[PDB]
Symmetry: C3
Subunit: 91 residues, 3 copies
Amino acid sequence: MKLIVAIVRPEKLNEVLKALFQAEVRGLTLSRVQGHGLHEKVRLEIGVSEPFVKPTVEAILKAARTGEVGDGKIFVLPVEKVYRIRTGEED
Amino acid sequence: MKLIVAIVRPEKLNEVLKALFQAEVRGLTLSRVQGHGMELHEKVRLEIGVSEPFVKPTVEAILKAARTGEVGDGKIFVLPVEKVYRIRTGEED
Amino acid sequence: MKLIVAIVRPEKLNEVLKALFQAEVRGLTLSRVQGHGGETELHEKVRLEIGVSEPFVKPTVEAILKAARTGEVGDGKIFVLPVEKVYRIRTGEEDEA
Ligand SMILES: Nc1ncnc2c1ncn2[C@@H]1O[C@H](COP(=O)(O)OP(=O)(O)OP(=O)(O)O)[C@@H](O)[C@H]1O
Ligand SMILES: Nc1ncnc2c1ncn2[C@@H]1O[C@H](COP(=O)(O)OP(=O)(O)OP(=O)(O)O)[C@@H](O)[C@H]1O
Ligand SMILES: Nc1ncnc2c1ncn2[C@@H]1O[C@H](COP(=O)(O)OP(=O)(O)OP(=O)(O)O)[C@@H](O)[C@H]1O
């Protein structure tokens, strides 16, 4: 499991979400943030299984790019364990 | 130390905070977020730094308190932490 | 590659940002959060998220430790998180170093 943290432009969020959904990546959490490369941005936090890391990264790279300074970055973090609250079971 | 990141239903936050307190967990950071499991739903994100020996009990406290049994309950991620510093004193870990 | 997460007092943000800028650390993301410490009811804090290369970990941590301190309970903490890889969206460049 990996946790992907991506920072994108607010005006590209809808496009990014659509790309993610099409890539079959539906579990995600987002929030409004401010950043410096202060400007308003959107932060996506996505926990994915190993096979979904690239698909997720690519969905965002392609959908969030505008070619102008401020497009954002994508961090891939290691995750030791993940638990599903509904069942109280690990992974 | 490890960093616990839990996404729970807003209506379960109080129960979770109470269980964490009973489990001797005091240090925590939280914020409001939106999530998908097209339509985004309001959730609350808790971020808790906890030392190895007590990660399990802390996770268990959250799991028990945040569950409803219905889809939408959320998840708990346990991330490794390379180093932790206390800003008040500057001390490592 | 590391992701530094620092939680500081809102009244110390400007100082912190200045120290980071001076240390040549410009890339960062921040948001407002509510927190409780191991010692005293939540209080508002500013959470900074800073992705840095290995050589910039010490300088970044040092800059925050200097600027955000007051010596009183509530000062906050700094978490240095391991990062497997980082991608720049505009250039498509990836870092792992
Ligand atoms: N190092 C970082 N750590 C945390 N967040 C960052 C970092 N760099 C950028 N961000 C986030 O991404 C947003 C856009 O930065 P971007 O990566 O687009 O900056 P640039 O200056 O356009 O690119 P670069 O910094 O790679 O030259 C920033 O406003 C911030 O929200
Ligand atoms: N993989 C994920 N990455 C990041 N956040 C997630 C992920 N999965 C779920 N979440 C967060 O938890 C919230 C609730 O998820 P939900 O409980 O709907 O997960 P499911 O896997 O879709 O259903 P369930 O896990 O309950 O069987 C989501 O709205 C989101 O905020
Ligand atoms: N273990 C933790 N996990 C997540 N967030 C924390 C943790 N400890 C502290 N915080 C964040 O830092 C803020 C200030 O903490 P404080 O500085 O009060 O820590 P303390 O350990 O409780 O006090 P001190 O570190 O100053 O002796 C808290 O309100 C919270 O936002």
